[PDB]
C-alpha cells in the first residue's frame, strides 16, 4: 500500500483511454454506431446527416 501515489497515476490514465474507447459505441442520435453500415445502407445524399 505504500506505492499508491505511483499506482493511481497509471490507473487514471488507464481509465481515460478506456472511456475514450467506449465512446466508439454510442449512436449520438444517428441510426447506427458503426460507420460502415450507414454507408452500406443509406443513399449518399442522405447518409451525411
Amino acid at each position: 500500500s505504500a506505492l499508491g501515489k505511483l499506482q493511481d497515476v497509471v490507473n487514471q490514465n488507464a481509465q481515460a483511454l478506456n472511456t475514450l474507447v467506449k465512446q466508439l459505441s454510442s449512436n449520438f442520435g444517428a441510426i447506427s454506431s458503426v460507420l460502415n453500415d450507414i454507408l452500406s445502407r443509406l443513399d449518399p445524399p442522405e447518409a451525411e446527416v
Binding site: 441510426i31 452500406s40 445502407r41 443509406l42 443513399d43 442522405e46
Partner: protein
C-alpha cells in the same frame, strides 16, 4: 382485408429481388425509412414482415 383486420405475412428463406418492385411504375407512393431502395439488393435480413 379491411384496415381493422390487416393481414400479416412471414417472409424468410428468400433470394429477394426488390428491383422489380422499385422499377415498376404502378405504385404512386414508394417511401422507405432507414434504407435506400437501391441498396435493398445488397443487404440481408433475418425476417421480413408484410
Amino acid at each position: 382485408a379491411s384496415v381493422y383486420a390487416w393481414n400479416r405475412k412471414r417472409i424468410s428463406n428468400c433470394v429477394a429481388d426488390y428491383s422489380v418492385l422499385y422499377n415498376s411504375a404502378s405504385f404512386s407512393t414508394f417511401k422507405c425509412y432507414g434504407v435506400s431502395p437501391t441498396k435493398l439488393n445488397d443487404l440481408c435480413f433475418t425476417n421480413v414482415y408484410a
